[PDB]
Amino acid sequence: RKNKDAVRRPQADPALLTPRSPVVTIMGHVDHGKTTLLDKFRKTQVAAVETGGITQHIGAFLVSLEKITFLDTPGHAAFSAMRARGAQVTDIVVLVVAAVMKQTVESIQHAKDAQVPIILAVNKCPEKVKKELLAYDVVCEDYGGDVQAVPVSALTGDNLMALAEATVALAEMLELKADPNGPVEGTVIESFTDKGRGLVTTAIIQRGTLRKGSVLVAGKCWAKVRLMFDENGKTIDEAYPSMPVGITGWRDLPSAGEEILEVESEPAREVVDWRKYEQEQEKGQEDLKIIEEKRKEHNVLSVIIKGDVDGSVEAILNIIDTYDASHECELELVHFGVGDVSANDVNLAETFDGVIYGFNVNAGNVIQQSAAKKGVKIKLHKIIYRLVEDLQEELSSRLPCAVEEHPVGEASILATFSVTEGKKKVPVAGCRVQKGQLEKQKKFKLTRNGHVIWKGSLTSLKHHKDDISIVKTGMDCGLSLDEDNMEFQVGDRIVCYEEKQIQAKTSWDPG
Amino acid sequence: PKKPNSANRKCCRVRLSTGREAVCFIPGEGHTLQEHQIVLVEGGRTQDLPGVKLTVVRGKYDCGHVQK
RNA sequence: AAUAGGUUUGGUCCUAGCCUUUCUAUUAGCUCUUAGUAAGAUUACACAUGCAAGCAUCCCCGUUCCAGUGAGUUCACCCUCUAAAUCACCACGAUCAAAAGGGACAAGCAUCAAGCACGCAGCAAUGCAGCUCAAAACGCUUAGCCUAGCCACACCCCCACGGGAAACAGCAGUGAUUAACCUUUAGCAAUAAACGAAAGUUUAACUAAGCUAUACUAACCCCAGGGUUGGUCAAUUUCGUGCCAGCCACCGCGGUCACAC
RNA sequence: CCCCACUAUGCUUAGCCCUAAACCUCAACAGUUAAAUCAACAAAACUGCUCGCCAGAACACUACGAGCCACAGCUUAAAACUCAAAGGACCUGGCGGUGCUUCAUAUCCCUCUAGAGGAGCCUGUUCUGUAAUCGAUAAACCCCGAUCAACCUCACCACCUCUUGCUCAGCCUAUAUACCGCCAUCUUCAGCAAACCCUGAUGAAGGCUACAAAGUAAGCGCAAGUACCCACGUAAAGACGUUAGGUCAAGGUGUAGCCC
RNA sequence: AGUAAACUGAGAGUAGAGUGCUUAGUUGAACAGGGCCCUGAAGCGCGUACACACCGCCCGUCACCCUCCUCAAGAGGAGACAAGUCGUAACAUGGUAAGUGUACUGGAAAGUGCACUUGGACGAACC
């Protein structure tokens, strides 16, 4: 098939290059003050207005100090891809460390992968932090390293001015320039479905100027740009390089992090078609292999996922894929999607006896009533770790009960008798209780020099021609089993035990 | 299939958009249909399969084309 | 169903069903160069946003129209009577057309056969006990229709004081849903409507554009794909397969020499 | 099913039940035999008028609803899933524990003679066994391919050896369900059939009566001739076909398969 | 009928090998009459749901799977799938002719009683 793909333009000519604003991404560990620092820079407060005070989305804001594009990456271990995406699209990384953690190390690794300058922000103020970072290849100027370290206090707004000065100086040193003309090149930061504006994508422009009516393609998707808005929702008539923008008009929802390229006209579709064909071919090859492998031969939790944005859905799916307890319980992902819980999700859950998990999405009264009618369980969460805990609870519920065996008593056989009762010969074991006590209700097991011979309950417990339920220590008792095949010797042992069912918890750990 | 034909016709039970479960034949040599996958099913009975009156449209949704 | 054809059987004749051949529409697969024109959500489910009703020396008039949808459904047609409206004003009338009265008026089900007051007389009091129905009453289900267009609805409670609640079945657009999916264009320059005495103003009506092989028309120096090839039915060489993989609208093919994969 | 005994029941009276292959499966009334009579069979073809009924098979004399003196009931009576048929009447053949008649001439029975099945042995086969063939294997296999295996024969097994090899290679490798070649069998039959013609309304099909009524028939077979001792008898002969009958191991050969 | 029976000889093939095969001869019988009852054949018919043709076809009960329907989800029914099992009910006078209504009975097709039908036959002069 002819190659109709739309490819990225060659690197811009030096004459066409024009200076642009810098893209700075704030990365770090959970509760290291990234959101608070961004709030202080933005002159607005949004850390307080959050569900649990956790940043669960990657947002881009155009701050005017000069102008910078700040990207707030989540600090949680769940949204690793999100952080990576920021590293892929950023020009400068502000690594915020509270006065080094796992996610800080991961963000450092992402920045090294992206080959991007790093500015250290010692929040909550330091020398110990720099000395530790020496191990992680982050060397401060005090230690002869290029990385600039700035101690700051985001809560009190201390030393932030010098932090901004260092960011501006590093941006000037980088000399970030791009072509503000020609076909548009950009990257998707997020994609979601607004009930009023359709499929919307938060993107960052890397090259060219985006305008209303521009035809864009991203992955298997394409759009005719209908509305370009900012973080506040106001329409913007142009999108210069290094400018966040919410673009509406996508015929299909692009995956987060996919490149966006402008094309000449809608009959774009061909390009999309070609890409689809390519993907099909790849899948087809895999299919062929599997099919050939077949032809040469010749406790199930099903979960629906509905998230507000594709990035959160991807993070949840990555968490799900880290499931390793398939032996005890099998976790099947029936369907994942973006948007509020809908009729198709309810039907899918009902069909497979699954459970719907809704991350930052709603469910109307009609949907809830339908789910109640069909026996579907919708579980709406606003925090990712709450959803993880709920999924773990469901998995544990699917797990069978674990029987705990507690020893109750022990008796040693002394003699074997044959009693003729009801025309039947019953073998009776005369046993002396050594430690503990024996109870009729509690189960018993037979031990022969350490080997386990029988497991069950006595058919008749009798002492001194009288039936007694509990024999104390040192009491003789004749024991008769329900199994006639069991042979009683002179030196056999009997161990009594009580069995209690206990709740079993999933062995899978999200970390 | 019913006599006198003999084969192992590749079929799949699917729940339709109408909420009804039905058996659909999967035409073509080799398929990779799995549980929870979405397909487009059309009419046209399979002659040798009693009770099968549907057919999966190859090349739509999760059902790819026949690999050459 | 026709100029008919294949198919019951060891075979023939008859009856009969099913399918084929033809023409459309929608969707799907594969494919697709241009121009003109026509047509264009699946859904009476929910709607972000922007616009869609002004004019005018103040009062008035219009916003009851146009535009939309097909949920509901023998309010549509003919006759009689006569409102509102136009003919400046009466027209001692014409045109147009409400309400009211009479008649006519979709499909399936009789395993819907009885409805249960459905009639008449009298000025009234009141009296008679009747009225409809197998020539389909009563009832249930389905459906917009008889297309220069007409009927019905306008978020639901048939209505809408009121209540539920805060309404795109106006245009552009979106969510959900479906196999089904047009631009968040411009102008009042033409016509139509509203207003004004008028120059004129307003109009998502409309006009001129946008997208789409859904259709028709026409063309291209280069640019062609889709289906089919056992019979019906136009058209197969060689390999591989070996009742397996697979194909078929019907009859059927495939078990080592396959015109059927 | 056959025999014996006995009851409900068959009968009477009074109510019910309301069904039948309740069929003469042929509606009532009026009329025609004119023709264009007429799918087939049946009990000829029709016309006018009216009523009742029917619309692929099966589901289904069913379910539900309704009505009934009926309570395991009767009447009316569907639908879903399924199939490409179901069905009616015929033609030819086979078959019948099918009728009538005539026969069987080593023959079906009663009969006549000698045997087999019982014993030992020879030999073949099945089964078992072995490292150790193959094929026939109901009549129509079983002293059969063999008018013939100690080596050879030999195609089997074990071990060893050779690679353009006795052969312008070879294979007893698979397929007798691709065949030729030679045969078994009905056959201890007498039919097969070209080319015509006629009947069936020009259907599959059928085609004889001698005081004759649609058959004629070349040819094959029977028969006749021929061999042995006759003209008798015995041989030989014995068509088309049947059993995908036997043989790929007499030989040849299609296809497929091995070539240190 | 020079048949059966008994006895003797020779040939083929082998280097040798059969109680085997082929062949010649010798002695040499008994019954041969009744019957259509048994098994078949022919002539004329009759029936036929078989047609690779009675070694045919075919019916019902007792498992699994699949679709649909009626249901107090357990179950029943129908159809397909088609097995195995128990019989052989129907198709020929199907071996008790078949069937309708109805009643009773039975593992199952089905059996029997009563009346009805030919969608059976009775062989079609006398004998």
Ligand SMILES: Nc1nc2c(ncn2[C@@H]2O[C@H](COP(=O)(O)OP(=O)(O)OP(=O)(O)O)[C@@H](O)[C@H]2O)c(=O)[nH]1
């Ligand atoms: N002592 C001190 N505390 C601070 C300072 N800045 C911020 N904080 C606190 O630290 C917390 C930082 O957590 P977040 O606001 O969620 O910012 P974050 O590091 O991005 O955390 P995530 O969004 O979950 O990744 C805030 O709740 C502040 O209260 C500071 O300068 N000094």
Ligand SMILES: [Mg+2]
């Ligand atoms: Mg934070």
Ligand SMILES: [Mg+2]
């Ligand atoms: Mg509708």
Ligand SMILES: [Mg+2]
């Ligand atoms: Mg009913």
Ligand SMILES: [Mg+2]
């Ligand atoms: Mg309607």
Ligand SMILES: [Mg+2]
């Ligand atoms: Mg609405």
Ligand SMILES: [Mg+2]
């Ligand atoms: Mg209303």
Ligand SMILES: [Mg+2]
């Ligand atoms: Mg609209």
Ligand SMILES: [Mg+2]
């Ligand atoms: Mg949409």
Ligand SMILES: [Mg+2]
């Ligand atoms: Mg369309």
Ligand SMILES: [Mg+2]
């Ligand atoms: Mg005017």
Ligand SMILES: [Mg+2]
């Ligand atoms: Mg008796």
Ligand SMILES: [Mg+2]
């Ligand atoms: Mg009497």
Ligand SMILES: [Mg+2]
């Ligand atoms: Mg009678």
Ligand SMILES: [Mg+2]
């Ligand atoms: Mg009856």
Ligand SMILES: [Mg+2]
């Ligand atoms: Mg009944």
